[PDB]
Amino acid sequence: PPAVPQTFQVAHLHAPTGSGKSTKVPAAYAAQGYKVLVLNPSVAATLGFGAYMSKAHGIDPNIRTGVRTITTGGSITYSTYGKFLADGGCSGGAYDIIICDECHSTDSTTILGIGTVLDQAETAGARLVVLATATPPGSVTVPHPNIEEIGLSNNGEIPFYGKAIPIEAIKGGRHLIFCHSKKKCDELAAKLTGLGLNAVAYYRGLDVSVIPPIGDVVVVATDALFTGDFDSVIDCNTCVTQTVDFSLDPTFTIETTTVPQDAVSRSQRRGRTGRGRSGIYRFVTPGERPSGMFDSSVLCECYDAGCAWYELTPAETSVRLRAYLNTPGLPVCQDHLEFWESVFTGLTHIDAHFLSQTKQAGDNFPYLVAYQATVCARAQAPPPSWDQMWKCLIRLKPTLHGPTPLLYRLGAVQNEVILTHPITKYIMACMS
Amino acid sequence: PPAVPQTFQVAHLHAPTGSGKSTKVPAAYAAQGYKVLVLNPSVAATLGFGAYMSKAHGIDPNIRTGVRTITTGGSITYSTYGKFLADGGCSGGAYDIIICDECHSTDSTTILGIGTVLDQAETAGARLVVLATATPPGSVTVPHPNIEEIGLSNNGEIPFYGKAIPIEAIKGGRHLIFCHSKKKCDELAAKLTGLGLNAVAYYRGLDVSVIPPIGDVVVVATDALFTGDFDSVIDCNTCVTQTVDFSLDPTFTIETTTVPQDAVSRSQRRGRTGRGRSGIYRFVTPGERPSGMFDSSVLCECYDAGCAWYELTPAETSVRLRAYLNTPGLPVCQDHLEFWESVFTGLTHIDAHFLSQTKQAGDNFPYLVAYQATVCARAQAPPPSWDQMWKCLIRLKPTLHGPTPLLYRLGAVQNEVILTHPITKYIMACMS
């Protein structure tokens, strides 16, 4: 619980997990007349705190979200970054303290949003602006005595990234596997379900409904993160993240490449254990990786998204993205600001009906995949392939043939690619 | 009105809607000695011309539809493509001039209708075939003389496909809203009726009466809607259609999807008002998509509705359709005629009970739904799911175990399945 200076200040509340950061601290604040606003990357977290904050603290916070919205009138508003950017940001929000929580996040939304805070807060009327996070940019993983950090040897057979988890000893108690991809995910889960190890896990687009409860059974699951008492975890130490490449063929190639886990995705994976009691931590490679900068690709999404939903011209999404940079204790990446801002300023006259469709079904890059298919339909030319990605062109299959006027490799490709579409050209020049 | 050449000829009309393409053109051919047949796709519209021609034209035409029939013995004949088909098509007929009104629609029937007539007419003694319309392929919305087109913003208390409707714009008069789904219609009307607004949800099934004829009113209705005399027509711009998506799992799939309106659909709704007393049109997503094309869905639905309703050999159907890809001016599609034909000839010994049951059920793909039933029972195994589509398999539920022999994803498969059935495999191979 930092000061509340009458002037202005940007406080960093670097406190560990379960400290009550998104529940107690605000409450402290909301007991002095100060009107507070707390932001969080996930809905399920927002709506979460939104209750634990009422049924055990005597407060009824307004809970703003896309899937749910509740207005009480309390001076504590638990909403989310996305839903915050959606509501126009602070553009209409009178708050005296703002807490960008979990700010260690490198996702399109946190960033753009935090950037939105960092810029408007100051004049929106805010008196303090808090950035909380268990694991901030830089700070290294710490030996938490509340977690029996135990190795991982190959005194078995069950192939696991190397340190083949011995089966003879490993049965299932309270453990919890941590994987990288969706595929190889269940690939193991069942490889042991023929023994008792359910294959349960959370992917990208599922309900917590698929969660156990009792029975000393081991579970699997990807990064995005339930029930059953996690008093142990088996991290794979292989994080996977999209990484832009400038392959000039004819332009970039947003490709999801795997890699060693930094510090934030190392201790966050250890943030889901040591709960309730003296947790345990299983890991293959001990060493983590210096965290602080995030790939430039993400710098694209703010632009792709900010353009898709939040309605921010490449221009706006910049300044916001700017202010977020100049601020301390927050991650960074190469200042490809001017380039990217460059690209989108041009990608004009996107077909309304394709953005709408693409975004709806939540496609990684809604605006970019909705543009690569406007040019594709005005040129009666098919898209780079018929993956579920270009489903928006489905109704045009009858009238569409020839080569694909490729604007950027956003994944698989299967047609003659012509690299001359006036735009492709623009984007090239923009690349220099 | 075109001339009836000494030789045989297929003409093309393009008069704007309501100029006699289906009223004056015929009367003319009639006031000469030519026996005219006029096909339209609507059972309603059909009976409409009968009355009209009489009320003022001094011509008692014989009508032919499902619900009725009225044979006055006169040369001008009005009839649906549905009834015309079922009447053994043109083959069983001697008409001098066959006008295929509304030849731009793309429904199982209206197509077989033209294919048949475009294939038989000549050899049947026909003198002329006139494909009429006022929105041929490659056509866009031409501004309505007396209809201001306004867009939608965010100034609105009521949501609406991303945009909002300013209550103020719908507080006086008779307004018609257009929503893709009835499921949605119901809601959007409620919210409005709770705002002291006279809301009435209308769609397939309901009683046309619900809609009052006087007083202020807003109709949250779906395509199915004259005496309505509406002031404005807010439109959701999206539309719903069925698409086939070959997905070797194990053969294909026919899911219903919500896709953007084509120039046509955006001219039936926009024109639901402004007719007579100057009205207004209000949209969400600007720029209408173009017309004239139809997903392989239709081609299957033909063979199906051609084995089920009109009782026609997969061979014979192709025969009819073959005379459609050919004639120029009619909508386009992928030439899968050879494929879809294969997939059917194999589907034999359908359980007539199930077929009849399904036909009399309104099921979209009856012959396809029944065969998956037929082989289901035939093999003593349950249907994919128990949606109100398989209803025909209840007296057997007890005597039904094991995984479903999935011939094709045509609905929502909710059961352990297999894909080794001799038939599944067949089509799978017919997949060429």
Q: Which chain B positions have a beta carbon within 8 Å of A399's beta carbon?
A: 293, 332
A93: number of Cβ within 10 Å: 21
Cβ neighbors of A261 (< 8 A, separation 6 or more) are: A235, A237, A238, A239, A269, A288, A289
Domain ranges of chain A: 1-137, 138-238+260-291, 239-259+292-432
Confirm whether A138-238+260-291 and A239-259+292-432 share one CATH topology: no
What are phi and psi for residue B330, nearest 5 degrees?
A: -90, 150
Fold classification of A239-259+292-432 (topology level): RNA Helicase; Chain A, domain 3 (1.10.820)
CB contact under 8 A, B295 and A357: no
A297-308 and A108-124 helices, crossing angle to 10°: 70
* Residues A211-239: b if buried by 16+ CB within 10 A, e if exposed: eeeeeebbbbbbbeeeebebbbbbbbbbb
* Exp. method: X-ray
> What is the rounded distance in angstroms from the CA atom of residue B186 to the CA atom of residue B205?
13
Give the sign of the dihedral formed by CA A323, CA A326, CA A328, CA A332. positive
Looking at the partner chain, which of A353, A356, A398 has a beta carbon nearest the beta carbon of B293? A398
Chain B 316-345, residues with CB within 8 Å of chain A CB atoms? 331-334
CB contact under 8 A, B285 and A357: no
What is the rounded CA–CA span in Å between residue A224 and residue A104? 14
Q: What is the CA radius of gyration of chain A?
A: 23
A356 touches chain B (CB under 8 A): yes
Distance of alpha carbon A377 from alpha carbon A401, whole angstroms:
10
The residues, ordered by sequence, that sit 6+ positions from B337 with a Cβ below 8 Å of its Cβ are B299, B318, B321, B322, B325
CATH top-level class for B1-137? alpha beta
Amino acid at B114: I
Question: Residues 43 to 62 of B: which have CB under 8 A from any A CB?
Answer: none
CA dist A51 and A53 (Å) reads 5
Residues of chain B neighbouring A352 (CB-CB closer than 8 A): 285-287
Token couple for A363: 């496609």
- Give the strand order in the sheet containing A62-64: A10-13, A128-132, A97-100, A36-40, A76-80, A62-64, A69-70
Q: Which of B241, B245, B285 should be substituted to probe chain A, the one whose Cβ sees the most A Cβ atoms within 10 Å? A: B285
Which residues are registered as beta bridge partners of B294? none
Does the domain formed by B138-238+260-291 have CATH 3.40.50.300? yes
Flag if A356 and B285 touch (Cβ within 8 Å): yes
- Say if the Cβ atoms of A398 and B237 lie within 8 Å: no
Which residues in chain B have their CB less than 8 angstroms from residue A395's CB? 241, 243, 259-260, 289, 293, 295
The partner residue sitting opposite B243, judged by closest CB among A357, A394, A399, is A394
Q: Is A397 on the interface with B (CB under 8 A)?
A: yes
B-chain residues within 8 Å CB-CB of A351? 287
Neighbours of B201 (CB within 10 A): 23
Closest partner CB to A399 (pick from B260, B285, B332): B332
Structure tokens at A317: 């999404």
Any CB–CB contact under 8 A between B285 and chain A?
Answer: yes
Rounded Cα gap, residues B267 and B282, in angstroms: 12
Full 3-state SS string of chain A: CCCCCCCCCEEEECCCCCCCCCCHHHHHHCCCCCCEEEEECCHHHHHHHHHHCCCCCCCCCEEECCCCEECCCCCEEEEEHHHHHHCCHHHHCCCCEEEECCCCCCCHHHHHHHHHHHHHHHHHCCCEEEEECCCCCCCCCCCCCCEEEECCCCCCCECCCCCCECCCCCCCCCCCECCCCCHHHHHHHCCCCCCCCCCCCCCCCCCHHHCCCCCCCCCCCCCCCCCCCCCCEEECCCEEEEECCCCCCCCCCCEEEEECCCCHHHHCCCCCCCCCCCEEEEECCCCCCCCCECCCHHHHHHHHHHHHCCCCCCCHHHHHHHHHHHCCCCCECCCCHHHHHHHHHHCCCCCHHHHHHHHHCCCCCCCCCCCCCCHHHHCCCCCCCCCHHHHHHHHHCCCCCCCECCCCCCCCCCCCECCCCHHHHHHHHHCC
Structure resolution, Å: 3.3
Strand order in the sheet with A279-283: A147-150, A279-283, A233-235
CA-based nearest residue in chain B for residue A380: B290
Closest residue of B to A88, CA-based? B154
| A357 touching B (Cβ < 8 Å) | yes
Give the best residue of A391, A396, A399 to mutate against chain B (max B CB count within 10 A): A399
Taking CA–CA distances from B289, the nearest residue in chain A reads: A353
Nearest CA in chain B to A354: B260
Query: How many Cβ atoms sit within 10 Å of the Cβ of residue B292?
Result: 22
**Chain-chain contact of B334 with A394 (C-beta, under 8 angstroms):** no
Spatial separation of the C-alpha atoms in residues A181 and A191, rounded to whole Å:
16
Inter-chain CB proximity A353 and B162 less than 8 Å: no
* CA distance linking residue B345 with residue B333, whole number of Å: 22
> Residue B137 has what DSSP assignment?
S
Amino acid at A50: G
